[PDB]
Design a protein around this ligand. Structure first.
Ligand SMILES: Cc1cc2nc3c(=O)[nH]c(=O)nc-3n(C[C@H](O)[C@H](O)[C@H](O)COP(=O)(O)O)c2cc1C
Ligand SMILES: Cc1cc2nc3c(=O)[nH]c(=O)nc-3n(C[C@H](O)[C@H](O)[C@H](O)COP(=O)(O)O)c2cc1C
Lengths: 178, 175
């Protein structure tokens, strides 16, 4: 199955002007390479676009440190459905950070998406309002998803509500984790 | 301008948050745009409310201080978030977390005002999150209209999200 070149260009434009970190991965092959990565993602990770395209995003990890998170990721990718998970990640300078990662299938068939979209949230970060910030990120993300087409327009409010909820919950878990 | 307005219209039709636009150049400050999530929330039809001031959502006098803050922010061309008691077309009550943002014109005399309505009391015990969610979505739309500079989008999102959460917490501490 194939997405039109015009849709792919729409996704590009969405990425280029987005105010949230966004990545796009090719699901057509098992290596699952990065194919799009926008400035807010580049600036969080300290990389340049030319450095990372063609690589799997696991480059952000070190050793094996996110075992259960990674198994949940693999399932959601094979299934072709959304997932939010928290990961220990590292910038290009090896400084660590915790990544609230949002995953969404793009294109293809219901159980065989053409791409996967990733949006990263840094649990650095703000202060005592991490829940609000994460929920805000999720609302902005849902707006971008709806522009792409992966989230049905009529369901935007419903996705955001649940997405904002799922995000705040994860932030809570992460905060009682030490 | 002319283009920017049809740009605003485009943003309104596509958006997933309730959005209204009001003309400040006209004495009664009439609604000139009301998008589908707004109509779906309020149950009014475009025909009944275009050309009218958004105060129709109110009944009686329950929002005295909120109204005064609103009038102040309108005169000054300032952003504002406030909670109002409002009513759907079938009379039913709901609490409305209203976001207001100046659009166009002068920094102190905008051509239009944008409003975005977030219904409180639908989200169970996840109201803070739902409201921050709405704020994040709203900031996205503000950036596409061009009223929020593209580079400031993330910083204004985080702050709007926090201000929405604060207002929710207050609203939960009331009897
Ligand atoms: C669209 C997309 C974005 C991703 N973004 C990240 C990320 O930002 N940080 C990270 O550690 N892993 C990210 N991943 C996950 C890795 O690419 C990989 O799928 C994960 O580590 C699990 O697979 P593995 O156990 O084979 O490594 C992303 C995956 C996809 C599909
Ligand atoms: C863009 C915009 C959106 C507004 N939305 C609402 C609303 O959703 N609910 C409400 O009760 N008032 C809303 N208002 C406020 C009324 O239009 C009016 O400004 C307010 O009641 C204060 O003025 P007043 O005391 O003269 O009525 C909105 C105003 C503007 C400019």
């Amino acid at each position: 199955a194939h997405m039109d070149q015009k849709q792919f260009e729409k996704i590009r434009a969405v990425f280029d002007r987005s105010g949230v970190a966004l990545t796009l991965v090719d699901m057509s092959l098992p290596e699952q390479p990065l194919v799009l990565a926008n400035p807010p993602f580049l600036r969080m990770t300290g990389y340049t676009e030319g450095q990372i395209l063609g690589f799997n995003c696991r480059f952000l990890q070190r050793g094996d440190e996110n075992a259960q998170a990674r198994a949940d990721i693999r399932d959601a990718l094979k299934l072709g459905r959304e997932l939010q998970v928290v990961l220990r990640n590292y910038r290009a300078n090896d400084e660590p950070f915790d990544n609230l990662l949002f995953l969404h299938p793009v294109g293809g068939r219901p159980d065989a998406p053409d791409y996967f979209l990733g949006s990263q949230f840094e649990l650095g970060r703000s202060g005592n309002s991490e829940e609000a910030a994460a929920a805000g990120h999720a609302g902005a993300l849902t707006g971008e998803l709806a522009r792409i087409g992966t989230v049905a327009a009529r369901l935007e409010m419903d996705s955001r509500r649940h997405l904002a909820q799922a995000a705040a919950a994860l932030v809570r878990a992460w905060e009682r984790r030490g």
